[model samples]
Every structure is written in C-alpha cells, then in structure tokens.
Target: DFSRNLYDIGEQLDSEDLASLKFLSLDYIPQRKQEPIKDALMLFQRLQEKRMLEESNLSFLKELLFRINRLDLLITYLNTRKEEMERELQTPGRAQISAYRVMLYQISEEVSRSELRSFKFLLQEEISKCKLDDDMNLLDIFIEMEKRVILGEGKLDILKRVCAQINKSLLKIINDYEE
Candidate 1:
C-alpha cells in the first residue's frame, strides 16, 4: 500500500494530509474530494464490511481524518485502539508481534533521544532473539544509525529509510496475519 511508502511519508505530505481536519461522518464529506463520498466513518464501515480495512487502511483513514480537521476524532480512535492492544498484550496467547513493533515505532517517535536510545537497545535485544533475517537486518541498520548519529554524520535519509523498513516489516506481519 502507498500508505506504507516512505517517499510519501514526511518528505512531503499529500494535500489530503494537509487539509483542514474536522469532525466527519456519513452525513458529512469534508469538501476535499473531487467527487463526494460518504463520510470517513461510513467509508471505514464499508471497507470493514468487505474485510478491506487492513492496517494500512487504518493509517489512511487516520490521515484522512487529519486532513478533514478531525484530529480530535483521530486521537480518540488511536487512544481506544491503543488501549485495546494494551489489553490484548496482557492476555495470554493474544499478544501480537506486529502490535509490539508498531508500539515500539510509535513511542520511539514520541520519546527523548536518550529514551529512544534505550528503547532501540531493548528493541535490538528483542530482535536478536528471533531468527528472521529481516529482523537482524533491521537491528544492523539501527546499529549503524546509532554510530552515525553519535558521530554527527547521520543524514535525514537514514531515518527515512529506517521508517520505511519498519513500515515494510509491519506490513509484512499484517499481510501474513491476513493470509
């Protein structure tokens, strides 16, 4: 999904991402689309009915909500889903690796550099426990990034690539689950 594409990530947001977000629903289209469609919630419902509301869809939906000037609603949904995932994490046999990875990526963006370093260390330690080649590659990239950042030689592209890799890994997990 293009939603997982880093080229579109922070390089430059789409007009849809830059729209004036606001509360939206089936009765109200945000006046952004060239053709009118149902509100964000209704679109979400339709997608859900077709089993099409995957993780990338969630990302797009949130982006749409932001564009329509409804960050309040987006924040509400994120908090609720976060709580749901937190509950799931506590339940035996219900914990999801994708959820953990997403959470790690989310908080890594929210924390201070020192805390992020700690979190990255812990993440690398966790990745080390797995036999997945991709996971090890992710750790390797992070190790190199740490060195580059410490030496003040890091480029913005490094973080962009990291985001892309993490997103691709998340997408892989989601796709595997769907299969």
Candidate 2:
C-alpha cells in the first residue's frame, strides 16, 4: 500500500522533470553512497512490492530527493502523502503512527525551546477553541504550527511534543480497534 502510493505519485512525474530540477546544496546535504536516482528507484520498487517502509527509508527517501535537488518533486509528493496520512489517521484501523511521530520529533530538534512554546500555546488555544478531541484536530493544529514555522519567523519543539502525543493517542486508538 505504501509503495503503491509512491508509485502512483511517481507516475505523475517524468524522468525529465526529475532531471531538470536543481540539485540541493551540497554543503547542506552531502552525497550518499548510492546514486540518487538508483536509491529512489530501489525504494520505489520496494514500496511497489508492499514492503513496509522503514523509518530510515522514509528519511533517506526525503534526503535523496533533496540531495538530488528535487525538492519541488519531494515537497509535492510529501504534501500529498501528508494529506492522505492526516485523513487516514482519522480512522486508521491498526495502522502504524510511529513514522509520523518520529518525523515530528526530528523536526522538533531543529528549533529552540521558547519559540516552540509559542507554537504550543497557539495549538492549545486552537484545541480549546474547537472543543474537539480527535487526531484530525490535533493534526490540524500541527499543520498550523508548521505554517507558522515556514514563515521563517520565530516558532518551533513543544509543538513537536504535542504531535508526538497525538501520534501516541492515534496508536492507542488503532490498537484498541485491532483488539
């Protein structure tokens, strides 16, 4: 399922589109052992085969895209996947939420504490304003927080913690459903 989703996305893009894209900053993203396209195709094939995408595989795929200077491709694909993920989290029967949780945690480590607090306050305010207790609602809060973070303005970690908590709750919900 995971790989099929990726394959579908890949279908929308051509090799030319991938080749024409700019390379990401070599300073920021060092080259990996395998060629970017090779790695991508390998991962793509693995996903196509219905193999579970490991946590590191997700990160590596993202990094490979970035390193290849295909962030436009990467972002578009990830954004679509993110939307699907948020929607799936709503009634995810026995689905794993750890990958998402880990992503949030990794992002959190990229920012300062005080900045993160501001985002968390806003998230809490949003939650209280809506008076809802759903994973979708929690995800919406993080989406808003990420929007703020994207503004290049100060905002950032506790938000990550909140996201982790949401993932935990999602896991519990799915586990209970499985039982």
Candidate 3:
C-alpha cells in the first residue's frame, strides 16, 4: 500500500525535480495537491508518510519550478499575498490582524530577498510620512501571535525571522486597532 501510494503520486512527477522542493518543504510546506489543494492540506497527516509526501509532492514542485525558472510565480504569489494581508491589516480590531502578523512573517521568510526588499522599499516610500500616535510594538503583535500558535491556535512556520522585520508602530496599529 505504501509503495502503491508513492508510485501513484510519483507517477506524474519527475524524481530529480522533487529534490529541491523536499529541501524547502522540510521547514515549511509538506505536500502539494495530490488531487486538490484543500484535500491535500487537510489530509496532510494521513497522506501516506510525511517524509515520502515531502519527497514526492512538495519537493517535486520545488525542483520542477527551479528547472523551469518559474520562481517568479512564488514572488508574484507573495506579492498578491502581501496585498491581501495589508488589506486585512487595514482593519484594526479584526482577529485577522493577528493572523496577518503571522502570515507576513511567514511570507517574508520564504519569499525571495529581492521580493521582500521590493515590498519594504515600496511600503516605506509610500508611507514614510505617516506618523504613529500609539505606543504599540509590532513585535508584541507578533509575539501575541506566536503565543497563540504555541497554545495550539495556529502555526507560523517562518515566525522567527519574520518577527525580526516588525517595528514598533506596526505592533501598535495591529493590536490597538489603529490605522
């Protein structure tokens, strides 16, 4: 049964292409959509063996993308992700603010350096004139999120490095519901 699952999943994927994805997935993603995205993620634990799925699914995509020079897809996805994130963060007092804080950390970590720099440059350039009137710490907002994850509410795979980028005012705006 195990071999069959592996064979079936690998049947449509290239082996060499699976290696890179495997390397990246160990710290973050576990698998790709075996058939559909939601099902693959929801059933991640039950999908054969975790290691094997890592090898066959996530790693496969990583390597394939590497070969295809499709890394831009990841960048674009992150861009879209950050946009959606800021949209939600704009609404203070929303539970999603905490979620956005964690999500931003995760995205910032796995995302390409050029992409992150581009975003930071744009955000700072456009919003530098904005002044904060609150005493909130973005790190605190992030820490609160980390606390929730530690308590089993959710997971932030890239939390450590992500927290490094947060500043004080962001924390104020996120937690205090300020703009």
| TM-score to true structure, per model | 0.21, 0.25, 0.18
Candidate 1 residue-wise lDDT, 1-179, digit = tens: 33333222323333343322112222233346555432333354444565545654454444344433344544444432444434544677643233444444445447897776666667776966422233456567556656656322334454544455778875555445543
Local distance difference test values of all predictions, in order: 0.44, 0.47, 0.42
User: Root-mean-square deviation of each candidate, in angstroms?
Assistant: 18.7, 21.3, 19.0
Clash totals for all models, in order?
A: 7, 3, 7
The CA lDDT at 120 in model 2 is 72
Please list all clashing residue pairs in model 1, or write none if there are none: 20-69, 21-68, 21-69, 21-70, 22-68, 22-69, 22-70
Cα lDDT tens digits, model 3, 93-178, are 63221343345444645779677766665676478543222354766655655655542223433443354367766444444542
| Candidate 2 accuracy as lDDT | 0.47
lDDT of 2 by residue, 57-162 (tens): 4643454444334556556666424444445445645334334444554455565877676677668868755332333465575566565563222332444344
Q: After superposition, how far is residue 126 of candidate 2 from its true place, in Å?
A: 65
Best by lDDT: 2
Candidates by TM-score, descending order: 2, 1, 3
Kindly indicate the candidate among 1 and 2 with the higher TM-score.
2
Model 2 lDDT, residue 63, Cα: 42
